[PDB]
Symmetry: D5
């Protein structure tokens, strides 16, 4: 699937950036670290705390030369639907990262986070080096959400270590 010290698998699909469908490849973010951020499904009963917590902290990822690509196995019309759902109605509201649609579940399968029996992704966070290789693989089972200071600490750290050692 997606070994850490090997090359990250390619992702490509219709994302939602700034309220519209953009059909984004991984190669659009060449020269950047990638933070590939799988959340399980759209429109959930729980409040989308971690993806709003990444979209609000998107400046901290623009400063570290990286792009957070939030992936789900849902179709891009549902992504565009709950980005356009107001945040007080359980929706996202303002969303400032590519909400990538892995409707064929090829990206979630290649990153080992696909729950094949239920067709959704594990709560996953993958930090791809700007050489294209994976470097970090935080995979949570469906309850526990990811944290943004954890991703920023590891992200940077990879930045400082790729600079010096």
């Amino acid at each position: 699937t997606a070994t850490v010290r090997e090359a990250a698998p390619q992702f490509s699909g219709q994302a939602v950036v700034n309220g519209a469908i953009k059909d984004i490849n991984m190669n659009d973010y060449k020269g950047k670290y990638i933070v590939l951020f799988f959340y399980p499904m759209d429109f959930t009963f729980v409040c989308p705390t971690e993806i709003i917590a990444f979209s609000d902290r998107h400046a901290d990822f623009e400063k570290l030369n990286t792009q957070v690509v939030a992936v789900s196995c849902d179709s891009v019309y549902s992504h565009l639907a709950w980005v356009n759902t107001p945040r007080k109605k359980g929706g996202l509201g303002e969303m400032h990262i590519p909400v990538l649609a892995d409707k064929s579940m090829e990206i979630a399968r290649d990153y080992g986070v696909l729950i094949e029996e239920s067709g959704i992704a594990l709560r996953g966070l993958f930090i791809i080096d700007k050489k294209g290789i994976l470097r970090h693989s935080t995979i949570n089972d469906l309850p526990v959400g990811r944290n943004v200071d954890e991703a920023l600490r590891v992200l940077e750290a990879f930045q400082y270590a790729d600079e010096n050692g």
Copy 2:
């Protein structure tokens, strides 16, 4: 996959009946004809004409001892989301049939309507005999929607022919 004169493959999953998730098996509708009605994806830019046209005409399927199970490869939270979307906002509104969630795309694969490259279903309509065997297989490519008088004519006809000959 799903040959006509052979037995229909089983479907089982979390549907949306009357505004909530019901976790419906095919065996819930034993003794009925099944009209398994694949629409491609949720929240589309086109108005959902054919599924509203089946949900409004659900009495014509209750009279012919059959159940229309509208399937999509989307998750049940998106189904519950756009059933609960008001109909003037491009949504469904009142939905009076099981909106079955084939999120693992196992039902759409078994019925040969799965578009594996894009993870959605072909516009499909399958009439399963109440012996469990398939009898009718109307599969459209993604533009052309199904009609309800066509399904009622074929449905009945199968009813009259299973009665007499």
Copy 3:
């Protein structure tokens, strides 16, 4: 066999057009939609209602830039025999579409309508795009016959959607 969104399989054989054998390939109707119309066998005890209902309505298919190719797994001598059988004797009479003979059952096998145990075709209707790809697949089990207004509605619709969207 014959997937919808894929390319339609080629058909080629001795048909009956206007009372004689013509040895017709699919490529004779390039640039047209094809309505490949499987009826099960010749000389049946039931009256041939659906094939007479397509042959009488052949102008409605000439207007929509399509050709209805009625196929059976019977040999072309039986096709020529019951086209030449008068219509009051249970026969066809005037027949204004290619009555294609799939005696080797290669066309009915490639279109998934061959009942291999009995050597006949399912009641099938397939609408091939004039790019050669299939678009529509109406397969009935042997009782219920096809309707012509259904085929005209779907046919057109494919016409309007291939024009605009």
Copy 4:
């Protein structure tokens, strides 16, 4: 397929005896020699000389304790159709042998006379011993028809040799 000195393969299907469909198995003629007589297809432009020449000489096969089962790869409705076609119109007329319908082409395949490319049978004549084993295999290519005095000579001969030696 059907070796001579081995056991003849079983045949079973809907025949036409005395103007109706009878659904005849090989086991109906246990204790008799079988003369399994493949003619290629129904309603041919040539006059059906050999099958009328066997049906008129059916008493010579009733006297030698054998049954001539005329087989074609056509369906039983075409068989019933051209038995009921008057003999001056190129048809059979009176037909006094089982006109067996091998529409699935399983009998013609098991007897090695199936022309798989065209779906018809070779002009074949097979004399099965009343032990069920084959004894004689006259296979003609499609021009040259079988003769009845040849079949009677070989038939008998098998009769005299199975009696004495």
Copy 5:
């Protein structure tokens, strides 16, 4: 083995023509119909009625542009031995056709008449077209011998049909 409508397999071996060994290939008789005539073995207790009946009627095969090649699975020394055996001592006497020795049983295996358990040939008669393809396949089990008027009727018939139709 030797299908009718396909090409006949090649035969080549030491025959006995006019009292001596000639080492005859099939290609020696190019441009002729071949009547390949398997008799089971030499020096049998029964009188060799059918091979004397072909050798005496060899003019009727020279007139129809064909060559009767009598084959057995015996060696050419036994063939030369019982051609040279006088006819009143159970032998052949005058023999006016190639008595081909299939001692390796390669010709009888390729023509499907080899009885592999006993190493002899079935009583077989095969009419090869002068295009080299088989056209006729009369195979008898070991009791019943072939007739010469049957072979002449079928032979001719193939001649008239290859001329006209």
Copy 6:
């Protein structure tokens, strides 16, 4: 290897607890969450910051009903050697967790963190549920070390979610 939502693979080997070799199985910690903590190799030139940071914070893992099992692919004599190396000499000093020796590299292979070319483990942290299934999989490439507040946050969280939801 070690999928998250599946069962964690078993680990068993000679660890170093409190300055001696204990030969510890996974089943010794049944009824606890496991925090399986791969560090790459012993005696490294970098200061062992993360394993001292887990051993000093071992009370925070004893309070959350879990056991941190620090694994390396080094032998237990090297583990006992650099636990017994004083901390000012680049060593561990006080070590309050099982320093498990995966010298056969079977535990690191089963947890997907084995770098097979160099025989060491990726910087990995795996949180096994006390049902024995994996729940969390933090894998770093060799530069970036793990953090203890991250493991405590995720650990707990799994604790609160396994309690309630």
Copy 7:
């Protein structure tokens, strides 16, 4: 095939003893050494020197508790034919050993003397122990015939060595 120090393969077939067909198995000569004596074919142009030289010296094999079974790949009717051919006409005349017919060439194949391309046997002589195992294997290519004093010397010798050592 037939290794020496292993068990001899079984032979069984229609032989010619004293002027008639006897259908002889190997088990008829249990408790005897067997001298299985392949000569190539019947009715040869060369005088049958070695088989007459064994049949005239048959008393020397009856005295050493052995049976010479002369085998050829010819049929038993040819064997009976040239045993009954007078010796001045190139034939055998008096023949005092089983002239075994290996017409299916199963005995010559099992004894490795079958020339598969020409269907005859190598000039072979095999001495089977009365335990059933082979002990001696003299195989000549087709020119050079076997000698009887050689077979008697080896035969005996096997007799004296099986007695003492």
Copy 8:
């Protein structure tokens, strides 16, 4: 292995000619018949009667343009040892043929005389034509030794038949 009518397998190894090791290939004796003479092993308790009987009669093989190559599966030091053992001490004494050492048992395996369970050769005598093909294969089981007048008779005979016929 070593079929008679096929080509003899090559032999090559360290022989003993005239009291020393010579490393002899089969190609050293091109243009000669070869008499490849396997004896089982060296230094046996029985007196080496047959190999002394060939070495003393070596002039009778030099006159017939052949070379007797005595082979054993023993090493060339044992061959040189019991050629140099005096003949009254159970040894060979004067040895006038190549005593070939098949210590790897490749020559005895290729000539089918290797007893694989005990690593020795069967008492074998093989006459290779000077075209390189085998012609004669006398294989004895371990008791009965070969005779020299038998080998000379067969040898010659092959000589006279290769001259004339």
Copy 9:
């Protein structure tokens, strides 16, 4: 083959003990260490220094509860021959260990010392524990012979370590 820490393969064959053939199995020396001592071949031009150096020092192996089994791939008649060769003639003379004959080269193959191309053994020394497992594997290429004080040192050492540790 023969791994050290695994079980030693069984050896069994005709040895030479005290001037005669004894047919010795490995199980004859159960409860002893085995020193399996491969020397390459018999009667070599070099003086047999190492095997005489083991046979003269056999008391030092009787004292350490072990048995030195000198193996070669030569037959037991050559072993008996050069044990009976006087020592001033390049022979062994007094030989006080089992000179085991691995003529089938099954023992040398199982102990990995067989040189398969030349059929001899590598100069090998294997110390089997009296549990039957191998413990020591000294394999030399053909020049350099084994030493007896080396084998005694390692042997003992295994003795002291199997006693204590």
Copy 10:
């Protein structure tokens, strides 16, 4: 693995020479005999007697044109750690040979001394010829250590025999 008379497998890895990591290939010592000296693991409770006994006697290996490469399956940081451990604390102290780190256990696997279940090497000593082929293979099970006078005797001996014979 590593056969004696075949070519030695290549070794390459980070060694410890004179207190630092050198990343040494086998090709660094081309033109020398190699003494590849596997000891099982680092920091053992037993005193490292054999590796100190080789490092102190390194002049005796520099004089015989050979290099002793002490290998273990431990990582090079542990090797550098216990070379730098003082010898009175159970460590090595002065170490005058390449302490090669086979952390991936590829060298110990290729030399057949890897104990795969425990990930350590057997006590092994391998003398590679300066042609690169192996010549000597002393493998001990884990108790019994190697001796230096044994290695020097065999080493030389290989030296004298590669000079003369």
